[PDB]
Amino acid sequence: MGKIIFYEDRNFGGRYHECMSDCADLHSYFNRCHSIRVESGCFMVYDRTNFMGRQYFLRRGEYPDYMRTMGMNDCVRSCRMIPLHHGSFKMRLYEHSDMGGRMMELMDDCPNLMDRFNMSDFHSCHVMDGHWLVYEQPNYTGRQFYLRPGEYRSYNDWGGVTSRMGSIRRITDL
Template sequence: MASDHQASKQQAAGSKIVIFEQENFQGRCHELNATCHNLKEAGLEKVGSILVYSGPWVGYEQPNCKGEQFVFEKGEYPRWDAWTNSRRSDCVWAFRPVKVVSRMLWGLLGRRDGDSQDHKIVLYENPSFTGKKIEIIDDDVPSFYAHGYQEKVSSVRVQSGTWVGYQYPGYRGYQYLFEKGDYKDSADFGAQQPQIQSVRRIRDMQWHQRGAFHPAS
């Protein structure tokens, strides 16, 4: 029977992203199949456009996987505003593949569909998982307000799946990657302010041909 680690290794082995210096996939380029802590060491001076052949991936504003986060799924990103609308920075200097164990891979793990939810996340008002909370299971939520939750988000517990949270409704603003585990305060997920107002699931589009996320134009 395959393990979670083996399934993650199989997915990572198939991860592929190509970084171009110029917009619209022009200029020098560099292909990645694994974590890159500093694109400058690969000989690139800037990032103008990105092609994701298989993923997903997360990019970082600063080397060594620090700073603002940008989530990339399978598809084309011809210029910087295709992957962010936070307006704070157009720099991306580090990348790593995101581990996603999809429902289709459960067969490799010897699991039945009823063993657990595909995606489950709980977001809490206060640090250390206290205060009011909103629990989301196998769904994308473009607005917490529409679900009656108007509080800040200071801690997060991901029980299954991989998620991306956004500062504002409609999947806008700063992005925060949530992988399985506990985030006791907003600093743990890289937020300067405890503000998340929408969240969605991340899927490996190599396996999920339907349900791909398409950012609004």
């Protein structure tokens, strides 16, 4: 399993909060958080309520500071827990919205999609299972998007607007 504790003070002090389940409302718990602590498993945090806004993926570890190191202006307002639920890992990509354009299959880590499919703008995608992190820029950098199981058909699916995806990481390491 996995557990995450949020701390208001930077030295892991001040108002503390222990979270171990999804939460589409962190403001009701705290309006600011300078320190976060993950003891085990992975935690998905959102800068907006209901799993929206700047999304950040945290893995088992202690985060002593994440306001200037992440480039934000407040704490997270939402979050989702990621349990050991990983059946199969495979991302089905489609160059056009829905499932049109060219279909590319991705079952591993894609640090340079430009060199792999010679295309950096796909308007559709789908996840067979597991958890996939998408990066607007290569080398796993840029606006990261958390795509989970289900089908994506446009920028309004992974909560994006453009399609400039250059890097992708397959969460496969606890």
